[PDB]
Enzyme design. Structure first.
Site, PDB file in Angstrom:
ATOM      1  N   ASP A 179      -6.217   6.729  -5.209  1.00  0.00           N
ATOM      2  CA  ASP A 179      -5.609   5.374  -5.283  1.00  0.00           C
ATOM      3  C   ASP A 179      -5.644   4.712  -6.609  1.00  0.00           C
ATOM      4  OD1 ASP A 179      -8.298   4.321  -5.715  1.00  0.00           O
ATOM      5  OD2 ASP A 179      -8.580   3.429  -3.734  1.00  0.00           O
ATOM      6  N   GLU A 238       0.997  -1.340  -0.211  1.00  0.00           N
ATOM      7  CA  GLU A 238      -0.129   0.132  -0.006  1.00  0.00           C
ATOM      8  C   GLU A 238       0.763   1.321  -0.140  1.00  0.00           C
ATOM      9  OE1 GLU A 238      -3.246  -0.043  -0.680  1.00  0.00           O
ATOM     10  OE2 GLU A 238      -3.927  -1.789   0.011  1.00  0.00           O
TER      11      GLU A 238
END
Ligand SMILES: [Cl-]
Ligand SMILES: [Cl-]
Length: 162
Positions: free
Chosen positions: A20, A11
Site C-alpha cells: 500500500d 482503494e
C-alpha cells in the site's frame, strides 16, 4: 453512491499481494495483511484470512468477502468507540460514509486522534472541520484521497466521487 462504491474508488482492487501507500502488504480492496516487512508473513496472514492455500493470489469473490468484513468491522469499530460514536450518530448519512472511509483507512484509534475535527464535525461547523482535517499527516501523505473525503464532510454530497 454508497460506502462500498466510495471505498472501491479510493482503494482500488488488486488480486495479488501488493504494497500500500505506506509500504505494507495488502490485498483486495485495501485489506491490510501485515505491517511486517516479510512477504512470507503476508502470505501466511493471507491464507489464514481466506481459509486456504492462496500462494498470494485471491479471487474477486474472495476480495469482496474481505471487503464486506472490513466495512462491517469499521462500522462496528465506530459504534463501540466512545469518542467516535457520538459524532457518527450526529451526522447525516453521506457524511457517515466519510467517517467510515477514514476509520477504514487509518483505524479507529487513528481517527479518534482527530479530536478537534471531531468536535467541529459534531457542531456542524463544516468549513472549519475541513480546514482542520487537512492539517494532518493523512492529508499530506495521501492528498487526493483525503481531499475527496474532506469534501464529502464539507458538503454532505458525493460530488467529489462523481
Ligand atoms: Cl480477516
Ligand atoms: Cl491519495
Amino acid at each position: 453512491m454508497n460506502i462500498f462504491e466510495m471505498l472501491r474508488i479510493d482503494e482500488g482492487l488488486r488480486l495479488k499481494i501488493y504494497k500500500d501507500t505506506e509500504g505494507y502488504y495488502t490485498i483486495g480492496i485495501g485489506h491490510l495483511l501485515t505491517k511486517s516487512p516479510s512477504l512470507n508473513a503476508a502470505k501466511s496472514e493471507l491464507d489464514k484470512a481466506i481459509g486456504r492455500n492462496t500462494n498470494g493470489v485471491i479471487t474477486k469473490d474472495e476480495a469482496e468477502k474481505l471487503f464486506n468484513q472490513d466495512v462491517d468491522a469499521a462500522v462496528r469499530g465506530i459504534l463501540r468507540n466512545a469518542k467516535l460514536k457520538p459524532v457518527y450518530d450526529s451526522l447525516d448519512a453521506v457524511r457517515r460514509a466519510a467517517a467510515i472511509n477514514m476509520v477504514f483507512q487509518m483505524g479507529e484509534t487513528g481517527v479518534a486522534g482527530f479530536t478537534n475535527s471531531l468536535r467541529m464535525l459534531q457542531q456542524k461547523r463544516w468549513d472549519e472541520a475541513a480546514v482542520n482535517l487537512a492539517k494532518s499527516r493523512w492529508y499530506n501523505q495521501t492528498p487526493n484521497r483525503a481531499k475527496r473525503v474532506i469534501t464529502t464532510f464539507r458538503t454532505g454530497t458525493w460530488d467529489a466521487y462523481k
